[PDB]
Design a protein around this ligand. Sequence first.
Ligand SMILES: O=CCCCC[C@@H]1SC[C@@H]2NC(=O)N[C@@H]21
Lengths: 254, 566, 51, 51, 103
Amino acid sequence: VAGINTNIEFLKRCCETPEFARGGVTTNFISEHESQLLKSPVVTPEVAAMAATAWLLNRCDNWRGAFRLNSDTNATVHFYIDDHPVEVRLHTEGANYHKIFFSVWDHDGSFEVCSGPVTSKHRDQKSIVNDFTFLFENGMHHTVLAVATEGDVTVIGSFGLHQLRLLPLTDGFGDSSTAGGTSTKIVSPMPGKVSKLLVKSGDLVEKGQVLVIVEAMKMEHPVRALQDGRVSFLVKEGEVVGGDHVLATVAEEE
Amino acid sequence: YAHHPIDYERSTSKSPNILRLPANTSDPTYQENMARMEGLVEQLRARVRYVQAGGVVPEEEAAKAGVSISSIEADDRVRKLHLSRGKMLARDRIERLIDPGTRFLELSQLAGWDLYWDDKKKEYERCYSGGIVTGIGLVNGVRCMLVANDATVKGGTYYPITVKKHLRAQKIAEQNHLPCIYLVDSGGANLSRQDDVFPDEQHFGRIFYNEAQMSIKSISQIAVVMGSCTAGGAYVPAMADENIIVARNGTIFLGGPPLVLAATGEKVSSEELGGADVHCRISGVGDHYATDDLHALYLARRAVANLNLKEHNEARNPTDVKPVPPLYDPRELGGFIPDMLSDVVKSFDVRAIIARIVDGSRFDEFKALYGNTLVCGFARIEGMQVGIIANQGILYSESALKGAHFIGLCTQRNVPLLFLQNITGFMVGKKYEEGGIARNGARLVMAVSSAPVPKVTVLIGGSYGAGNYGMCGRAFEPRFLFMWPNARISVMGGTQAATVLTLTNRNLKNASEAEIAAFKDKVKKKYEKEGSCYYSTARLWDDGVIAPEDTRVVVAEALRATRLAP
Amino acid sequence: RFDEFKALYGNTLVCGFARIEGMQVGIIANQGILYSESALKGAHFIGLCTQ
Amino acid sequence: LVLAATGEKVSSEELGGADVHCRISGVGDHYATDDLHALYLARRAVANLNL
Amino acid sequence: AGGVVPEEEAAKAGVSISSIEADDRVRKLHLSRGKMLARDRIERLIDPGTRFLELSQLAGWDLYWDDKKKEYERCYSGGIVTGIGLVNGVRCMLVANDATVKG
Ligand SMILES: O=CCCCC[C@@H]1SC[C@@H]2NC(=O)N[C@@H]21
């Protein structure tokens, strides 16, 4: 099954090493052999090669029609295996899309790869499920049905099943402001007359709520500051303030 | 720094900054606003029903509409008598004419709502519509303008609101190169307001002018003569590529049956005077002679078919498309709209509205830190790239510069524009006047008027004064206009005009309370007596009136209407 | 199939649209002794076809 | 250059650099916090050209 | 990667030996600032799986003769890199000013 982790690996481990083929197992039989169990095959550096390759091809024309000048191609994939990021680099020499190499965990080799029919152009949550063939130089050959998505790459073959999580790289791409915001924030025009402040002092403001509302000839003109961090008020409701006054200091939460 | 993607992921993910995430919390404030909106739409959505099947509302529970009680029996009697004749008294001709499963617009509706005051003080003229019904229709794979003359002849065929509606339809069709279909039923002319409707310009002659200027540009037009069209109404059957005369009740006259009397009054049958004469007469007038209403409508459809526009429309507007909905529920559009009748202007937002209307809830901001008052950027509306100008606050010189720059880019790359009107908001500070604010306002208006891009405006609310000149206005050729219920179109000041005109009007220093009762209350009554419901649409000021919730569908109709253009 | 214009009037001459293997066509076929009205109808048809 | 001609030197930010403080100048369409952000906005602007 | 060739076996190129350490120091100082010193901006900008041309390359190869008789000005490129790039399904010209301001 692909898509959700299962205990199928556990059950097989419960069947191979434990000598319960004899037939005598107690009610607490599971308790003592917990050290022996909960064990899965080690992801060999080769598995990353087929898994990494599938994500590209099963997403775009990477390595397809590629061309540079007096040089050679290069494209890299980052895997977040366990709690340690993993980098795999793939490149070609010659005029061959077929001849491909790899270098993961300081291990280098060569292989060729032949794909199958292109499927799932819509690349939805299910993404693309295609069979792959890989001829490594040593001499082997492999077949791998890879349903790859942005979240993970799942490879199923004679090795078994392994899903490799892709290193997540997302963090409010845009709104990344570390500015101190010391003074001159949400300054109001000359008329002043601040009132009806609906924000608590020392509370985080990342979304642009109405920090202060000042009225200038029936002009609420809400400031709507979007500077991240807690906002500290130096004014009180009903207090007439001068032009460009420091009504509050919007500073990073420290 | 430990960050090396290829732009996508950062893009093509459900986490791009392009989108918008204003999620409401449904608090009292939301309720106060959301509820009112609901209080501002129910009847809007209702009067429509009442004028539809006008004057015959069997429920008799139309108290949600402030419309006065009318004699239902008289209207039902008239409709029974008319339907006994053999012709369908309704808009039924239209939905019979348009292909099933297709769209419709109803361009101008509630036209002539309680417009004229009769001799009876408590009675207005019962013009449930403008006398016609106008909407964009898609016939046989061809987009067309549909104009149908209603059988309401009790007040008279055409009014200053009827000819204006017809001429607006003709101008729209000519601009957009949509062929017209006219359904003709007339009582002749109105010999009471004839000075107001016959002479001068932009009158009944301009209809004849347009029906020839169109055929110069080879934009074929079709008319169906269901009943009499006298008093200059007989030229449309004569000025027509194809015309249809029903076998029995279809009549065309240049001189009335009473007119032969008192001038060689050898009266003969109304058939021989110019009506449908199916006897192989010498006259080659009228292309189609159809025995029944269905036969006539069918021949109209068949003639519409042989125009070769199907290929061109199918190529220009893709028929098979995948709808992309916004990320947030369109029912929430009424909530972000504030309440009404509030002494001081309430607060307002735009991001939420655009995030609710556009495709995928996304936006492409230009400079927003600078000239924080005005909002401009690209978008997506059902597979088509759009530019939006939505106003928020009091305009500055820099806001005008940013608007001019945006309009420059949009004209450069041929991107349509959408307008969301708001307050005037011209600062009056002396330093601002000394900073050449008038020059920058001129900079904005010059670009607005000079743009050859198709332009549509929709009223958000509070469009009062000369500020609309900065964004857009009816006098700046918007190919369509639509309105929300909470709209006020008035003098340069909605609330301040009260304060200013209080000072300078023959007021003694004393009697202050009686004076403010006579001045401020009176000017408030004057400047909010006008509103979305009456002063607009009924007078074909901003002819379209819509709901805030269904705005994107309407704007998508408009944009598909403006791509057959040359 | 055929798309008749006025056939009760100027019954001599025949004019209307058609279809010939996926292409819209106009046909003028003559039947009888021409009148003035037949000439008018022909002129009107040719006007539409050119338009 | 400000020195030796009214040399009231101030910060290089105020002399014309990236001034993200809502200055009066409407110069420069995009203000991006990072290299990736700037490249991404460049790509996004390139997108809306209809080519 | 002008002036930084860690292999130090570039005898196949008749180029004279240059101070690799100085160029590496300059690149380290520049990258510490927070901006990518390379043509990296380009291949980040162009869609993956697409083509590139590099219109003019080796520009300003050993062009100017300095005051030092055995030394030429170290213009590894013309100061810019130019190539045809396909961005977001749109073909575009890409011109990038290199951070070489030493000359
Ligand atoms: O902050 C104070 C300035 C208030 C400006 C009010 C604007 S100026 C033009 C327009 N007409 C009015 O009555 N109010 C607005």
